[PDB]
Amino acid sequence: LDPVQKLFVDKIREYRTKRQTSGGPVDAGPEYQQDLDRELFKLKQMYGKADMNTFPNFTFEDPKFE
Amino acid sequence: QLEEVKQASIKQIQDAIDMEKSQQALVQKRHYLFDVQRNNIAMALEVTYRERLHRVYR
Structure with missing residues (x-):
């Protein structure tokens, strides 16, 4: 989102989710x-x-x- | 007459020369081998310590 930092948020909470998964960020998966x-x-x-x-x-x- | 006196004077100095030189030669080289030899030896013991530090660090 383009209050541009919301696109950083857009990414970032999906970092937040991913890093707040395990391995830190995973879903990279077996491949x-x-x-x-x-x-x-x-x-x-x-x-x-x-x-x-x-x-x-x-x-x-x-x-x-x- | 003249031959024998000059003949002896030559022949004696011939045997004199080689033998004072033969004396010096045997001493000097052989002392000169010793410390030579031991160069060659000690040369390697440091390399190997030296080289080793590099090899183990890698």
């Missing part, structure tokens, strides 16, 4: 989710697969003085 699932997985492909919610730890060694 979004398969899309996510690929790129979120695909990310891991570039990027390695382990402690993306914990700390990775590492190791230190030598072959020989060739």
Whole structure:
């Protein structure tokens, strides 16, 4: 609506509804989710697969003085 | 007569020269190998610590 901020309201209460759903704003739904699932997985492909919610730890060694 | 006296004077300095140089040479290089060698060694222990910080941070 064009007391223009009412079009922000027009949007905004549907943000209010959506964010005042769950996930914050959802209704994006499973189709979004398969899309996510690929790129979120695909990310891991570039990027390695382990402690993306914990700390990775590492190791230190030598072959020989060739 | 003259040959033998000049012959001895040459032949003696020939054997003298190589042997004072042979003395120096063995010492110096071999001392010069030691600290050489150990360069090469210690070179890598820091890299690996060095490089490691970058690798783990990534």
